[model samples]
Target chain A: NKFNYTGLGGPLNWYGLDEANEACAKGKHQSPIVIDSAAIDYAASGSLKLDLPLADGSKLENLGFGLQVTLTNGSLTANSKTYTLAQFHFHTPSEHHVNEEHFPMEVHFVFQTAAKETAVVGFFFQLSEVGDSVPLFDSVFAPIDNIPDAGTSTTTGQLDFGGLLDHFNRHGVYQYTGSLTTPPCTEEVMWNLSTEPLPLTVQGYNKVKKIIKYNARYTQNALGQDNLLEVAAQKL
Target chain B: NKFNYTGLGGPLNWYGLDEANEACAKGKHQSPIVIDSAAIDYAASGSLKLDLPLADGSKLENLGFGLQVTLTNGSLTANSKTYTLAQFHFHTPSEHHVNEEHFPMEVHFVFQTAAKETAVVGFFFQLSEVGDSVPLFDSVFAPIDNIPDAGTSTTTGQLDFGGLLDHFNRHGVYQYTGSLTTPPCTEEVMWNLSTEPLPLTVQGYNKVKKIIKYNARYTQNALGQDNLLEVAAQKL
Candidate 1:
């Protein structure tokens, strides 16, 4: 397989040769899957603790926190359910398809029910000069050491996850079936990613990079699966 | 706080008014820093795993595979040391400091030593036309349904990691210090990242994606941390 990193023969075979590649090459859902930021209804339901189980049997007590959303007219099963904000994690570079290109940073808002089955709400983060304070960070960076371990669930550790709605894309979002990006990638999970990246302050941005250090994935092939479809970023 | 999401007249006062923004405007490592692939050192020693401890008494078992190697005069750390190959995970997008820009999908080979510390190896992945056949995935996705708990050891799984290395950046790589991307945001850990990505077959890519629906993190402020730095990717 040394051929993969060499000239003319690389992962393209795996990533580019998939059935999804045709969609990526010919479908409108390809990169720059624009976000209108008009259709999304970023609602503030409340917050919840995600029983994020690491491969180690230990769980990240309330590992994730963010806004509670009820996607109306959503492409998937439509229902009004409140999602408590759990902790949020990041990806280096990025994963969401953009206008012909992908950028750095993708964040997942991990949520779970009493049963402990997990669901992660996705967001593609683009670095921008536009300034804005991300609420999740304020909640996280504070007890920076609390990470790697589960902490007692208390209102003191909460962020205004209810307020993240201001950054929601009214345009629409994307949905799919996948597992958490980490190991034990449990499948059949739901993914709802915003089209446009919520604006972030550069200072705030670096703080994230510091912890994740390097954010990247070993490139895998798209194979038979579809990269999924994009709905809308803005609400029309 | 009612003004929190009111957009302009919110409960939060913009901390604007500083040299920080000005610094970012002129700094090279600023937001979305762009690094031309040609300029990085893609061949760095990476993919080593060792034991690390969390404050809660639990350990970061099987830090992903790959090693963050230190180099001297264009060579890697002495061979006597063995960085164990831990569990490899993906970032929906990748982030590293080169000319400064994030990429989609990067992998971290988290390593530690007999000391119970961490040494995270970061790799930046680019979208290429080649196929990636990483053996790591074989262990990760082969038996998708019976995923052990998080932090559980996957080394005993079926993948032959050494065989997969034939396709990666074998020469030089970048190095730095940082923490785990998720909570506990542990700091002071060493980092090593390869400019080249471990490739996957289209089938392989989706196979993993099917498991980890969206295992990626969003970018937070990374530049602020003094321990973090960028080294060119290795091409050797």
Candidate 2:
């Protein structure tokens, strides 16, 4: 009724099962942190203006802890403010990690602002086929594994995050400011991730690891994020 | 791409198209007001403790501007503060109007706190046939007319909203704090709106008016609310 990822409502007992979840076990800017790509910090950046459009009324839910996508529109301008893109989800064997390596997928995307705040983005994929073809995972990963269970969802059509960010490489840009890996774990949330991976096509990474088979969420600790900002390593 | 409930990006140009939507044309506690109910005051007040739950991993989206639902889980208490159920939508012939009449639909739900604020709730249906049957409209309105377009969605199953608030008469609530009838309108938003009116069943209001035929929104003008609190009339 309050959570579940496994025994005793996992994720380290979601801050003792909700007292409005004390920031999921006391937040310290939490999130799926692990990015240690040579201790990146390319010069305390700014200027991430992603205008993510292609969410023409988006929807592909199946929220049994994973596989989401509600965007319905888009927008993102970062620090200068303008956050739209409301929803996007998925996490399996991945939830941020690149130098620490973990990838069979991860994709957050969540934006909000209008003062509601939140920013999210992340991405990671990497099942490699590279001949290209992940138009948002062929438009919502097999209608989310043909929905038959697990808090269900559907509408397997229309998607384009501008043709899946034109098969990635939107440059490095890592940045951070986490919290919200689930539960009421709501911290300042501003993450940006994207050191450019997203290959996927081992049948789109086993059809998204068979509908998100591991809803990842464990790695969380960068306490006071000591300037976690990779910010483009030249490759535009 | 910015907004639309009518002409020129509508809602009277949403506060000149964002400056953070100047509270949608200069807020003053805006919203779809109408409720004259014979100018009933009923002892202005607070206290709206709902706990809505019956959204088993819910989905049904279609966000082409209407028909939404995605609480993913649930909760709601109000001023004493609980607020969880963060998604529920729909609007049509009715967007709030009472003694002045205007109903064919309107839903809202919304909730959300943990410092995000926003309360929502509002109901209003009325088409008639009270013979019962609206388990959240047999679970997400026929998969929201089996989504085939308009920002699609699906997952036609499991919903409860406590068996559709046991078909009405929560004994007249109607409080207010307004704003957010859409766009960046987001004002204080605490509205309650419920003066017992849940009839439906004219084939469930023509299957949600054949997939939200008119997305309604035109009424906002409480302008500094001089006393918007119908509260309850005593029945409880």
Candidate 3:
């Protein structure tokens, strides 16, 4: 009943914790991979179509594993099909890497289609001595101190989902098919990792780290996984 | 049936728009006054009691009159009572002034008690050569182009109400009792205007202005209104 990122029901033991999560250990196309810039294959054109209609009234939940924000209705449109945004969670120190470069934070925006197909968009935050704080992240992170313990929730207000992408570089994208990066690591998820890295202050990184320390899973290999990685320019 | 801030069914004609709104013209206490710093009375010591549980995912509506955000669940605690957060709207060139000086923008966070008593907390944004853009405002303003026209709505995502106050100077508050600044001008509402001004960028101001050009209501007189004003240091 107690699953954590550390000992006992940690990432290594997630598959064993529940029978339904066999994919955690056995999935071929698992996520949280080290994306090397040199290995990226250039595509002719087109990018992942994403549409997020967000308000400022999202609910925040502390699941003991990490903090997640529940999304009622947002969507991702790609390949002429659309998936509704379910929720988004975070990983401190990042789970995905670029040329083996680790970031201060990683955000996963999860979505599910009507046919139950899944797609996820990932963005990584690079720490800097000087930069502006991401508004949405700040809003979500502002009340981190108020969460007493796990399985607790509080209202933060509304969020403007569109603004989260203002500073995002939509020109380049890394695409692949992978499994959920956590327990019940189901495969067939379409992954879109932004080639752009967001800016974050050291203090901001420290705040998130203090809350969900070492929540990222170790990188999984992409070899022999039938994972086709492609790079393309997208007009966001 | 049309009420606006301009000619015909404007602020001057709001009362004639409907019989129930007669207070708009006859009301003894309307809002949006120019606060003269010299006239402010220093209270013994007590700031306005305010609590805003803002999340992201607030709904933004373009009423043609102005932009409004729908707050699902937020609250303001003041006068020993808790008032749930209702919706908040914006005004260009600000609705309230300090020492007869206007700000670039004014934000009104409206809350109501169980008995329907209203209390509004106001924040003024001052443009600066260098400063971070307000997160909640950025989120809400990011999707300005998508709204199409008035009476339309779009979701921006969740907002962190706590973060909205991060740049806010909560130490000093200008307190007064007034009526709604717009039509129906109901009285007995508690008004708390932050004495401190947050920083804003010119680009941010222009973006908001393009969508809502001059939506501010003219200043009302404080003389002979029996309006009592006080300034105090509050720990909101």
Candidate 4:
């Protein structure tokens, strides 16, 4: 029942893990889907109302699959459906791509509604020499040395999640419907992915890469390619 | 009731065409999957025996969707089962990919087994200014001017389907289980695709490009992490 990124325990083998993971191969809405810019409904970006007042002092853990931080505060509303921000996770060598091009890393902030629908806000990151410390990346990846193994845990001081996003090209996001990028590969997740990439220094990237090491799932077929934007309206 | 390769008629809308094509968006095993070299099972390349004595005088038609030729003369034997070569088709901008890289063209020689299982032998083609005229390309494309519209048909004079296949890295084929690339998008297909590409001249490719345009289906999810080769053993 162990799943890693390569060999027999890889993404292709995920569906066979159990009944819950059947979506791994069967589900058309599986995640980390390729994001073609031409498919983005650019004009509808302003439709969503946002209030992600995420606070500080969340716990970071290396859940073996990757690094994640659980949250108790923050909510997102779109299309009259509300979802509570659950947790944020990282993937080294991004799972999703813009026009089949992968970035250095990606962050997924997952949210869940009381009715069980899921929404994920994904942001891509590019590592370069020009990278500077940001509160989110610095706070999340800073404790890499403290947790070297799976099932490891640590507290990385005060990491403010919401105080860092004012500079992003926030409106230029590709919205679609997809599944959880990992096991059980569940469907009906509303995906809001940023077209612009965040900057991460090579030093900062190396810190996350050492522990996360190729955790990104292979991009799935563009989930429900037909109802992509429509599903966003209905599901979110 | 119409399905073409762009906008409203393109691949994304294929599944909604009818209930028969439910596999397009929901099926586990789909077609044109990315061929990662590491995933291929190199040891069992010689397990299935092949006998493709394809003859000439087949009918090539530009059926709006793409160009195809049907034959009743050839037979392929593998895995203790027998299949009769039924038709051959062309897809400009090869549908399948080697680690996500596409070729200029791909030819699918489809065969049907006694029990209604489908097997396809796909060969890739690349165009160059210094390309030589192969018999298959010359014979199949010679009457291009005759078939200018969809539903047009002609007898491609003396194209030796079997003779053109020997030079292929036939032994170096990547075999897997997937679905038909077209509508109905059926599953449980045995795909034998050559790693080595055939050469086509610039003019030869142009003749095909002008007629077929872009008929290649986007690549689908890899059927399974396991039983790729075994699927051929059981189904073929």
B166-221 per-residue lDDT for model 3 (tens digits): 43434567777777887777888888777877666656665665466445554554
What residue runs in model 3 are displaced by over 4 Å at the alpha carbon?
A41-45, A225-236, B1-236
lDDT tens per residue, model 2, A56-108: 43567766646786664767676568888877787765666554445556788
lDDT of model number 3: 0.65
Docking class of 1: incorrect
lDDT of 4 by residue, A151-203 (tens): 98887667665644554335476788778888877888888876777776656
Q: Write candidate 3's Cα lDDT for A61-154 as tens digits.
A: 7766587998857777776888888999888657776654455578999999778999988887765434467777777787877774777987
| Accuracy of chain B in candidate 1 (TM-score) | 0.51
lDDT (Cα, tens digit) per residue for candidate 1, span A5-89: 1111121122233333333222322222222234323422332222222111112232231111121111112244434434556
Q: Single out the weakest 10-residue window by summed lDDT for candidate 3 chain B.
A: B227-236
Q: Would you list the C-alpha lDDT of every candidate in the order shown? A: 0.38, 0.61, 0.65, 0.67
> Residue A168 in model 3: shift from native, Å?
4.0
Candidate 2 clashing pairs?
Answer: A30-A179, A57-B151, A173-A232
Sort every candidate by TM-score, greatest first. Answer: 4, 3, 1, 2
Question: Using alpha carbons, what is the TM-score of model 3?
Answer: 0.47
TM-score of chain B of each: 0.51, 0.31, 0.87, 0.88
Instruction: List residue ranges in candidate 1 displaced over 4 A.
Output: A1-236, B1-86, B95-101, B124-132, B145-157, B166-169, B220-236
Highest-scoring model, DockQ: 2
After the best TM-score superposition of candidate 3, give how far the Cα of residue B128 lies from its true spot, in angstroms: 27
lDDT tens digits, residues B1-236, model 4?
A: 28766433555556545657666656667787768867865425445555556466668898885999877666665666678888888987677767444565799989897789988888887543344557766887888788888898988887665656575434487878888888877888888887777877656665676587567665554565332211211211
In angstroms, the error of model 3 at B32 is: 62
